[PDB]
Design a protein around this nucleic acid. Structure first.
Ligand SMILES: [Zn+2]
Ligand SMILES: [Zn+2]
Lengths: 193, 56
RNA sequence: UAGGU
């Protein structure tokens, strides 16, 4: 009785699409019967189909577990470094799903909303791996509410077609080196004043 | 002011770390265009329909 | 138009 109950953003909210509100991507896309409110201000950006997992191509299964780990680290490093030039990157999430709406999705949460807007304004005129990058503001805020639970512990029985994020995590060595590298870069852009 | 105090404090503990803007990136796939698209901008390529998202 | 409040 401490507060009023609500249903906004939930699967009981039959007007707004719960999946687009939490995951930033819906299998129905622009033809969805439920509302996809696209934010004008956000800290998180979306680059759909940015990560092409080699295992989903010809000769994909020609790689060792070490080679696949070094390859994804190269991609996560290539993503984090380039996005850092727009602002402080709080979190970088890469989706390993196979559904059309989530395959290779790269979400980037910046610290300031202006850094996110400057990113999509510049990215939408750039290229990555011989493909033009699509960039837009995403309503995703808490990635815990968008990730699949049964994929964290063991594997999800829905597989790559899960409508929740199957985030591919990079090596902890690379993630730690990236956070320390960004703090130094941000500290160095502070001694100027 | 403790701002310049904490800044030089953070910098000194991160002496053996490279800033992110310096990091040598071998095989960076950014700004790489497919053959023949040197004069096509990313906006013109998306509107051409040759590069659709998997949803479409 | 769902499995996730
Ligand atoms: Zn939807
Ligand atoms: Zn799942």
């Amino acid at each position: 009785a401490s507060h009023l109950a609500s249903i906004y953003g939930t699967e009981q909210d039959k007007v707004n699409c719960s999946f687009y509100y939490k995951i930033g991507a819906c299998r129905h896309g622009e033809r969805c019967s439920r509302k996809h409110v696209k934010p004008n201000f956000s800290q998180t950006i979306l680059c759909p189909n940015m990560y092409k997992n080699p295992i989903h191509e010809p000769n994909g299964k020609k790689f060792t577990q070490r080679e696949l780990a070094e390859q994804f680290d190269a991609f996560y490093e290539d993503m984090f470094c380039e996005f850092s030039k727009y602002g402080e990157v709080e979190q970088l999430v890469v989706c390993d799903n196979v559904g059309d709406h989530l395959v290779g999705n790269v979400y980037v949460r910046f610290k300031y909303e202006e850094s996110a807007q400057n990113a999509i304004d510049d990215l939408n005129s750039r290229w990555y791996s011989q493909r033009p990058v699509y960039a837009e503001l995403s309503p995703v805020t808490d990635f815990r509410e968008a990730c699949c639970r049964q994929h964290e512990t063991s594997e999800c029985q829905r597989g790559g077609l899960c409508n929740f994020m199957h985030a591919k995590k990079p090596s902890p060595q690379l993630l730690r080196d990236l956070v320390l590298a960004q703090r130094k870069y941000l500290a160095l852009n502070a001694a100027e004043e | 002011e403790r701002s310049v105090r904490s800044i030089e404090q953070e910098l000194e503990q991160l002496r053996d770390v490279t800033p992110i803007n310096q990091w040598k990136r071998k095989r960076s796939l950014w700004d790489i265009k497919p053959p023949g698209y040197e004069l096509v901008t990313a906006d013109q390529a998306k509107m051409s329909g040759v590069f659709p998202l998997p949803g479409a």
